[PDB]
C-alpha cells in the first residue's frame, strides 16, 4: 500500500509535468519552434501517466483546472510565471527555459525515486526521467544550433555532462 | 485614414476580447458549465474581427502570444489574474465574473465608439457591443438560475437595467 509521503510525491509530479507542458505550449505560441509543440505533447503524455497512478490510488488530483498556467501548488505557479517571462526574451532564452524545466524534473524525480520502493511508482518515475533526459538533449542540441549552450541548475554538473555526451535513448 | 488614437483603441480592444475568451476558457475548464465554452467561442470570433481591422491598417498586433493569460497591455494581465481567482471560488462567482467582463466590454466600447467617425471601425464596435449585451443577458439569466443576480460595475445602472429587461438580440 501507498504511503502518505508517496502520495505527496505523485501529487507534486502531476503538476510538475503540467508545468513543463504549459510553459512549452506558451513558448510554442510565442516562437513557433516545433520543438516546443512536440515536447509539450510528450509532457501531456507524462501528465496522463501520473494521473493514471493518482486514479489507481484514488488520490485527489491537484489539477482541478487544466488551463495553461493554473496550478494548485504555488511552487508551480511561480515557476510558470518566472519561466514564461524569461523565455519571452529570445529563442535562445526559450530554449534555455526548455532545458531548465527538464533539469528540474530530473532532480525532483531522483528525490522522489529515492523515497519509494513501490515498483509501479518507480517504472513511471524512471520512464519520466528518461523522457526528461531525452528532452534535455533535444533542447541543448537546438541551443547549440543557435550558438549557445546550457549550464545545469538542479542536477549535478557530472550528471548533466553524462546526459549531453550520450545519445538519445 | 485612421488616426493614431483610433489605432490605440483597436489595439486595446484586440486584447480586451482576448481577456474575455481567456477568462471564459479558464472558467470552463474549472466548472464545466457549457455557457463558458460557448461564449468563449463567440469571444474568439470577436478577437478575429478586431484582428481583421488591425491587418487592414497594418497595425502591429498586441497579441504576440495567443496562449491563455498572456497579454501585452498589463491592464489585461491584471484583470485576467484577478478575475480567474474570483471565478475560482464558486459557480456563482464564475458567472458574476462572466457578467463583469461583458460589463467592462460594453463601457469600453462606448468610450471608443465616441472617439471615432470611421464607419468600418464603428460597425465592428457596435456588433461587438451587441454581442456583449447578449452575453451579459445570458450570464445574468444563468446567475438567476443559481438564485443570484448581478450588480453593474462599469456601465450605468440605467443601461444595465435596459439590457437585462430586454430580450436576446
Ligand atoms: Mg516530463
Ligand atoms: Mg466580446
From Swiss-Prot, chains A, B:
Highest taxon above the source species: Archaea
Xref: SUPFAM superfamilies: Ferritin-like (SSF47240)
Entry-linked InterPro entries: DUF2202, Ferritin-like, Ferritin-like_SF
Name by which UniProt lists this protein: Uncharacterized protein MJ0754
